[PDB]
Design a protein around this ligand. Structure first.
Ligand SMILES: c1ccc(-c2[nH]nc3ccnc(-c4ccoc4)c23)cc1
Length: 255
C-alpha cells in the first residue's frame, strides 16, 4: 500500500522481509513489475566508524558482483547523509530458516549448496576478505542456488556455534571461514552443529578450544562427506584444509 523512490525509479512496497535496529528490508515491485528486495538503512545515529564500515561493504558488494553469481545482486543504490537504499536481488528464504523447517536433506541438494558456499566464500577471499562470522543466516536460496548475503565488513543473534578455536582464543585468516563452513555442512549432515548439545555458553567455548574434546563423526554412506567434515574441523588452523583444496576435493568433484 506504500511506495518509495530509488535513483528516480519508483518501487511499490509489498511487505517487510527483515528488520534491524537501524535497518529494514522490504519486498518491492518496480515499474515493470519485477520483484526486488530493498534494504533501507537509517544513518541518523551512525558514527563515522559505522559509516565507513557501511560504505566499505557496499563498495565490495558492488565490485564482487562481476566475479561470482553466488553473491547477491546489487542493482542500484541511493546514499545520503540520512539514509541508504539498496536495490537488491530478492531471495526465497535464508538457509537457517530453510534447514530448521526441513527434517531430512537430499544428498544432492547438500552437495550443490556446499559448492555454492565454497564459490561465494572463495570469491571474497580472492579479494582479501575474510568474513569471520559465517552462519546459515548469511546464505540465501534463490533459484535453488545459495548466495552469500553479506561480507562481515558492515557493523552488526551472535551464536558461537560456528565460531572457530582461533576466534575464541583471540577474543583469524581464510581458515577461520573454513571452520564455520564446516560447521554448516556438519549441520546439514548430522542435523545439529558439532557443539549444539552443550547448552552452557562457557562450557561450549571451552569444548571448541579443547583438543581432548573429540568431535563425533558418525559413519555415513558418503565417506567423502565424512572426510570434508574432519578436514574443516581440525582445531589447528594450520592443519585445517583451505578453500582451494576444498574445491578440488572428491566430495565436490566426483559424480
Ligand atoms: C528471506 C528472503 C529474502 C531475503 C533477502 N533477499 N535479498 C536480500 C537483501 C538484503 N537482505 C535480505 C534480508 C535479510 C534479512 O531479511 C531479508 C535479503 C532474506 C531472507
Amino acid at each position: 500500500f506504500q511506495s518509495m523512490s530509488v535513483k528516480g525509479r519508483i518501487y511499490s512496497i509489498l511487505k517487510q522481509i527483515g528488520s534491524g535496529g537501524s535497518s529494514k528490508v522490504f519486498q518491492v515491485l518496480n515499474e515493470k513489475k519485477q520483484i526486488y528486495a530493498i534494504k533501507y538503512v537509517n544513518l541518523e545515529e551512525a558514527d563515522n566508524q559505522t559509516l565507513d564500515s557501511y560504505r566499505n561493504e557496499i563498495a565490495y558488494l558492488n565490485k564482487l558482483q562481476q566475479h561470482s553469481d553466488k553473491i547477491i545482486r546489487l542493482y542500484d543504490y541511493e546514499i545520503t547523509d540520512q539514509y541508504i537504499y539498496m536495490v537488491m536481488e530478492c531471495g526465497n528464504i535464508d538457509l537457517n530458516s530453510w534447514l530448521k523447517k526441513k527434517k531430512s536433506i537430499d544428498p544432492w541438494e547438500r552437495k550443490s549448496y556446499w559448492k555454492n558456499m565454497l564459490e561465494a566464500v572463495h570469491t571474497i577471499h580472492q579479494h582479501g576478505i575474510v568474513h569471520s562470522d559465517l552462519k546459515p543466516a548469511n546464505f540465501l536460496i534463490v533459484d535453488g542456488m545459495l548466495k552469500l548475503i553479506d561480507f562481515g565488513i558492515a557493523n552488526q543473534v551472535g551464536t558461537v556455534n560456528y565460531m572457530p578455536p582461533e576466534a575464541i582464543k583471540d577474543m583469524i585468516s581464510p581458515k577461520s571461514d573454513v571452520w564455520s563452513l564446516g560447521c554448516i555442512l556438519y549441520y546439514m549432515t548430522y542435523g545439529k552443529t558439532p557443539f549444539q548439545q552443550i547448552i552452557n555458553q562457557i562450557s561450549k567455548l571451552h569444548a571448541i578450544i579443547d583438543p581432548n574434546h573429540e568431535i563425533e563423526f558418525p559413519d555415513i554412506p558418503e565417506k567423502d562427506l565424512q572426510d570434508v567434515l574432519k578436514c574443516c574441523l581440525k582445531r589447528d588452523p594450520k592443519q585445517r584444509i583451505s578453500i582451494p583444496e576444498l574445491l578440488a576435493h572428491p566430495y565436490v568433484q566426483i559424480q
